[PDB]
From a paper:
Adeno-associated virus (AAV) are small, non-pathogenic, single-stranded DNA viruses classified in the Parvoviridae family, the Parvovirinae subfamily, and the Dependoparvovirus genus. The AAVs package a ~4.7 kilobase (kb) genome in a non-enveloped, icosahedral (T = 1) capsid with a diameter of ~260 Å. The assembled capsid is comprised of 60 monomers in an approximate ratio of 1:1:10 of VP1:VP2:VP3 (7, 8).
The gross capsid morphology is conserved across the three temperatures. At 4°C and 55°C, density was observed between adjacent DE loops.
Residue numbers in the entry:
A (entry chain I): 415 to 518
B (entry chain A), D (entry chain B): 208 to 724
C (entry chain G): 415 to 621
E (entry chain I): 208 to 311
The structure:
Amino acid sequence: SSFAPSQNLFKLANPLVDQYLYRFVSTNNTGGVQFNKNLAGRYANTYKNWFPGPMGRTQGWNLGSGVNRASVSAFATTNRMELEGASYQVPPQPNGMTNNLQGS
Amino acid sequence: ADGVGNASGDWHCDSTWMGDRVVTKSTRTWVLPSYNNHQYREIKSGSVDGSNANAYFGYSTPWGYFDFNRFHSHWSPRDWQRLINNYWGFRPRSLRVKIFNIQVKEVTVQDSTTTIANNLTSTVQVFTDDDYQLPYVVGNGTEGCLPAFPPQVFTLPQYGYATLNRDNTENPTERSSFFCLEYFPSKMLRTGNNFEFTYNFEEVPFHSSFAPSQNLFKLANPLVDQYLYRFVSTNNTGGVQFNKNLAGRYANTYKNWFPGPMGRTQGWNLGSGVNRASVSAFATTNRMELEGASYQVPPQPNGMTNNLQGSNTYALENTMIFNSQPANPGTTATYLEGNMLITSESETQPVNRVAYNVGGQMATNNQSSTTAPATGTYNLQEIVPGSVWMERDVYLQGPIWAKIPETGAHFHPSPAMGGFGLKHPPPMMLIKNTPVPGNITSFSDVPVSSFITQYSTGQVTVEMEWELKKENSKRWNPEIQYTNNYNDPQFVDFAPDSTGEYRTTRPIGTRYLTRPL
Amino acid sequence: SSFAPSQNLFKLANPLVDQYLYRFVSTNNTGGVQFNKNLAGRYANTYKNWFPGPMGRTQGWNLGSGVNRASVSAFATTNRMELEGASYQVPPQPNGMTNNLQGSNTYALENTMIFNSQPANPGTTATYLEGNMLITSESETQPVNRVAYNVGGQMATNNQSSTTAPATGTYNLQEIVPGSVWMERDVYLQGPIWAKIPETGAHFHPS
Amino acid sequence: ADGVGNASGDWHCDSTWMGDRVVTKSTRTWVLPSYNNHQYREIKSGSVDGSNANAYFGYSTPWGYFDFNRFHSHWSPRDWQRLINNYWGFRPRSLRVKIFNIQVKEVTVQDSTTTIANNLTSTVQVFTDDDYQLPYVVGNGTEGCLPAFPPQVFTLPQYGYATLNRDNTENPTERSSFFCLEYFPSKMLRTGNNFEFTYNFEEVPFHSSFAPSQNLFKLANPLVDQYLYRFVSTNNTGGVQFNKNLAGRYANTYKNWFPGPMGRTQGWNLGSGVNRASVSAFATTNRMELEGASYQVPPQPNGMTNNLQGSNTYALENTMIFNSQPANPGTTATYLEGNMLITSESETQPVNRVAYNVGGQMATNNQSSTTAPATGTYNLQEIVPGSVWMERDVYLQGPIWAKIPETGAHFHPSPAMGGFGLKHPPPMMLIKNTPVPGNITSFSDVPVSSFITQYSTGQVTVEMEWELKKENSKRWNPEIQYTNNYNDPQFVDFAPDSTGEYRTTRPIGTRYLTRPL
Amino acid sequence: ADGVGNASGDWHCDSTWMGDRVVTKSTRTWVLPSYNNHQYREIKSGSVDGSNANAYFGYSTPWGYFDFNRFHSHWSPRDWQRLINNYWGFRPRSLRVKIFNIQV
């Protein structure tokens, strides 16, 4: 599939209309629980059908003018997996992540 | 034949139970405002309420749309009861929609008289998006569906979408796209005209509406021992010792199958539960990351249970929470437990893991003569070979389907909120009022900004066909049914009030009949 | 599939030829990043298409001459899962691991199928030793499957800077990942032929 | 079937790419004022702004017309990109127009209430001029075309023309002609009626959209010498000397082909260029003469390039200059470079001569022992045997076609502004509101001057078919494409604004793909 | 017909865009060394560069192989541009290989 997505995964809702779904906002001076309605284009708070792909965290490094850190050996801190009692670098990772974030 | 004094449709609202099929027909009356005053407006937001995940860039359109995607649009409370008490499953087979009896009304204001007349020559535009070329906003759990109660008249929602924004701000990207909805061929309808559309659902699995009658880990025969042995201990020398697995000891027995995935969400005590005072509760919710922003996912993924049977503790971020009554747009009011319809997944607790507890433990070290064995608990675990779970239950107040996002890859495309994941779902049906310019006496090369203000109304009928899965069971004793049960009712539930306001006190899910694993 | 893999999952590349792919080796006295070419038979450093199956860590125990540890009760430290507010031992684990590593004495024993050399009376509480037991080994799957009593790898735990150095930490459990390959539990003459998949909404890889 | 409550058309706006054909459908909404109050008025002007070339004599009519003649009427910005990036040429094959959903609105004013009602019995008149008997005003680069953006509603322009005037004054001649448009048979349309017309374009050459990948004078092989010799010099005696033409020396080599025609126009430095202060610039423009008057020709003839590649210098009288937004009629405001869309022909610079430089030099004398050879530069040169040039490029904002004037003779009938010269272009489609008299209680032999004031609106769809020329090229490396590229955009280009105003920042031409000579 | 003075193939390097199909033809010239001097040699390594994941046991052969598996083998930079700008996806349908004009 050679195309790029034209929408965000979590922004798929209509920004004009509110949801009919409610979220747990807080609790009062008694332990009683309180709820608010999910409003229009608030995409932090809305309910989601779908979720991002798998991940694992790999170290980011600044190309170009990025300052980075001096004199790193960088082999000991790479991500690794184990087989048969040995430890291998997997220099591509599994699918479902993005290495660069846009113009950073 | 086709004209102002001849009705272009009839009112079909009904249900027909035939064998394994059932067809549900429902007709409603709608009203369509003229949105934006015939303008496309670029809408955007920065970070609000302290979160840059609320920033977006997008467009709002003059158009509005029909939304069929809640169950109570198609189903009566008595037909939903007949379904959930008698059947093990259902899936939609086909759909057909009709829009008829169109009425365009011109409104004018002179010194606050505000007269209304009907414009017999005015048109409405309707197209269906068959190729899925527009952003699909329907399956996302937002308002504007056909009402639950047939007498109610409803406004169509305004169509709009969010595209890419830049650096978690309100500004666009180069990949931000604009879709003109005038650039689709559409059908123009006057008063005597009508519109008709037919759709066939792709093959999906039945929604399984039953509860498991056994525990996942108790599947062994309690009368007979296993032929398998377990490592019990080690003697005063390091030598290892074994015991036989006996009869009904289900902590110790070998397992073929394992529970579904989990992640831990905070449990909160409803009713008499004591909880904790004055929590802000936004900072401690579960979140995921995209593009450098942090989003709450208020349903979680499938494979957990929010409530454990008759306990007061709920996850509330694993729950679908509804209001017993509709609300005004943009309501910031605070609600209590009594105002809310709070669903419980506890009928899935045999096969699904509770969301507010740890999921288990694993070894954290290598032992030795010097060091003793150690474990630690894990708060999250994902799909594992040989996992079995149950999907989110469907409710009469909830969504029917969702559209699977178009990307390279996906896994087990079941929507978190509920229903049927569809690669090609029922298309969006979009409608607008065609503009009628005001009095223009001159030529100008700038577009006409002065229009006659008008709205339209009409009827829409939807007809869906459903395939049913018979309940074939050898259970001897009676089962649990959804019953109409209230102690000293002051009103009847799922009926109009003394004012005329339709009241629904409680949520109704599909899982009542019981089945063995 | 009754065969053993004749290659290692991570050694699938040609040892004679170098890769056309480069790796981040280091950074100079300025923060500038440096790269080296992946050479021939260096299999620690090469790029991989495929990844091992899922894991979770279970305690290894030394059979035979292995020294182990004295007077362990061993119930509290087993791996468990939760249902309905109770905690169950799962004495087989899920597929995608190997209990024994080739000719070592160390076994997971909670990743193993353990049989008796002879049938027993119902309700026998007697204690058995290694000699009474038939203890299976999955070690023929070790090329493609990860050992159960070791960590499965490591990942980055922080964001570096000029001030802070890179850091990692090991993980004791990992689940299904796109592009994973493993082998299923082997079948034995003394073992079960089939199982019934539980009737629910959903399941994954019903082995 | 045909009546007030039945729509007489549908909205077709779309594009279909099939093989070498593409069909573009576009529908718009129009509004037609009643012009002149149903009168034919004689319009005229004397010399204004210090020029007697602005004097004219003519007529304005109650009629108005449909103008299809800009590319953005028929083309999307994404469809234009797909065209110009993938193809070497295009030409129009056929056209069909439809006018439907007619609405006539009567407006009345009592003590400033200004009510509007619709007159269901009122008519509109439509005819197409098939035999080209009227003055053809369409191809002349004037406003009133269908909008670029489909949601926009537009007014139809008023039809009018200029005939002969006498002695560069406002007075007529004996050959000044009056054309009554009522003296054509036309079709009268009420609300249920519609109009349809079909046209086939005559055979024209493809617009060549590519850039030359070689220089006209560099066509020789740089590796091999010519077998031809040049006169280099003469020795201390008058004897003449010769040298061989060597390899890649392209100043000296023999040429088969020569650049196109030229005339010199003043170059002006855009951006950081320094230019000159406080120039009036009307007196120094290039002009031509007719009938004793002096006219500016703001496009020049074809065969030159206005810009030389990445220089700041433009001719500005060889350029097509557009506004990024439409303007009000009769706007005398002054605009800067930022408000303007200024096109560049520099992709033609290999084969075309720059407009702001001399074109060459020739011998001005006969030499002798006494006198030395002399030359001088020429500022203008015309068509020469063996000339090759490129025609003006077409833009999404520019004209599609022009009509070749009907006279005895013409040469190479390519319009200066751009597009396709047509002997029989698409006919003019003219429309007016039929008059409805007011209350007349008496007989008079003078014509009725009192009418009901009313306007009409409706929809018009145009469908054009285009023939495409595939790009067949052996170029190894990638080419230049039109891409959507902006650094820190605050808005997306070719989309509505936050107010609803459609924004186009830059002009888009057809020449991107490259081809060898 | 088949002999020393008759060419056994022609040079086909081209691309044909037809509808939803495209066929890419590419011809190259190769040279094959005689590897190992016609021997099978057992190759092996211990831990090198401080990692026992670099240890291996295997064999090297006199043989050599054809590798078609990079995109630029089959695609021009101008044909790759025409593909990625105009289309949402691609997959390989079929393949055929020919080896000809052998010279020892």
